[PDB]
Amino acid sequence: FQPTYGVGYQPYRVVVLSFELLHAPATVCGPKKSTNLVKNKCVNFNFNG
Amino acid sequence: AYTNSFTRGVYYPDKVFRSSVLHS
């Protein structure tokens, strides 16, 4: 690689974030505030997404 | 030497709970 080359020949850094978007327990999350838990009442909910 | 495997070697195919069901 030389900076004199045309953009087709220029270096690109590439990253591929790969997700195991499984049923299995999550070691990674988006930053979100957890509420406390609730029971025996009709609620909207989110567990691990 | 060789032998019969009988009904060995089933394993939980996915990390999901299921109960009282015949699952394909």
Curated annotation (Swiss-Prot), chain A:
Segments of this protein annotated with the region Disordered: 23-45
Source taxon at top rank: Viruses
Subunit structure comment from the entry: Binds to host ACE2. RBD also interacts with the N-linked glycan on 'Asn-90' of ACE2. Cleavage of S generates a polybasic C-terminal sequence on S1 that binds to host Neuropilin-1 (NRP1) and Neuropilin-2 (NRP2) receptors. Interacts with host integrin alpha-5/beta-1 (ITGA5:ITGB1) and with ACE2 in complex with integrin alpha-5/beta-1 (ITGA5:ITGB1). May interact via cytoplasmic c-terminus with M protein. May interact (via N-terminus) with host bilirubin and biliverdin, thereby preventing antibody binding to the SARS-CoV-2 spike NTD via an allosteric mechanism.
Task of the protein: Attaches the virion to the cell membrane by interacting with host receptor, initiating the infection. The major receptor is host ACE2. When S2/S2' has been cleaved, binding to the receptor triggers direct fusion at the cell membrane. When S2/S2' has not been cleaved, binding to the receptor results in internalization of the virus by endocytosis using host TFRC and GRM2 and leading to fusion of the virion membrane with the host endosomal membrane. Alternatively, may use NRP1/NRP2 and integrin as entry receptors.
Name of protein: Spike protein S1
Range covered out of full length: 497 to 545 of 1273
